[model samples]
Target: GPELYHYQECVRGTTVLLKEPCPSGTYEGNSPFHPLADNKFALTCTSTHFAFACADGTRHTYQLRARSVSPKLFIRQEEVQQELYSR
Candidate 1:
């Protein structure tokens, strides 16, 4: 028998509101591939805004906040932190 696994889906109405002056492209919460549509960036958070590194060989700082419940995957917690930060 094959191992039964699950693909956690994003909750309904899970949304993210990026404050003014966010980088280009659309953002959607609970998405499998979100944060940016075409950008390969990692998101770090602060009380005021988010700081992430972009694939275009640049650093980014922008305002961000999430509304409603979203899957843990999007958070990218310590897993992404050390890895992304290690660079």
Candidate 2:
């Protein structure tokens, strides 16, 4: 498993520095730790929190940026519905 880090928002939509370089096909996702999309690679925030998995199996470093705090309520609702339907 890869290590996770928490970052604070400083600027909106700003690109943060990465401690390590992510390889191609790296599936970056959004999590509470990294709320911004800039450092989150190709991941989008569908809800308040989400997790991204690496496709290349490479460890990568990332930075955070201050930006708009958009809550993904719709996405969360959809997720809940799917969970219930599946169950």
Candidate 3:
């Protein structure tokens, strides 16, 4: 099954999220692929304003934190040494 998440570069722009997968080909969007063999796939963003790691071992895009963590998946922790804001 695919998943869903949302992102917006501008506060006044449209954010896209979905409940689907690649279907068959390369995805035009850049969220992530899937989980590892044993380890489950996790979606997260480090700097929300900077960059984040993806399932494919490459940097994706900015991960805006509407909160301290994503309320979608089963997150173990949401952490940082310091953060500017979580809104």
Candidate 4:
């Protein structure tokens, strides 16, 4: 069964949103393909388009769908130190 997945990306100070509904499900090993054996799927959405990745390393074109949710925004602060840093 195929389902819709949505995502967003920012480029050059502009935010883009994209949604993909009914992306083709195939046996190909690549992006967007449901890794039946692993049950893992990867998808990406942007202001202009969408993308999918399969487990076998296959990628496919994704269609744009309607907006449904508010996008999440975040910012990371970086501090530089001379000493080595460990997490």
Estimate every model's Cα lDDT from 0 to 1. 0.35, 0.39, 0.36, 0.35
Can you tell me which runs of candidate 2 are displaced by over 4 Å?
4-10, 15-20, 30-56, 59-87
Off by over 4 Å in 3: 1-5, 8-19, 25-33, 36-41, 49-63, 69-87
TM-score of 3: 0.20
Per-residue lDDT over 16-66 for candidate 3, one digit per residue giving the tens place of the 0 to 100 score: 232223222333334454443343333343234433344544443344554
Q: Considering TM-score, which of the candidate structures 1 and 2 is the better prediction for this target? A: 2
Which candidate has the top score in lDDT?
A: 2
In model 2, state the lDDT of residue 51: 29
- Native-referenced Cα lDDT, model 1: 0.35
lDDT of 1 by residue, 1-87 (tens): 122221222233444433322355333333233444444433332213334333343444444332224324446564224424566
Tell me how many clashing residue pairs each candidate has.
Answer: 0, 4, 0, 16
RMSD of each: 15.1, 9.4, 13.0, 13.1
**Top-TM-score candidate index:** 2
Model 4 per-residue lDDT tens digits across residues 11-63: 32332332323244343223233333234343333223444544444555444
Tell me the tens digit of each residue's lDDT in model 2 across 18-84: 3223423343444334333444333222322222345655444333433445423356555234423
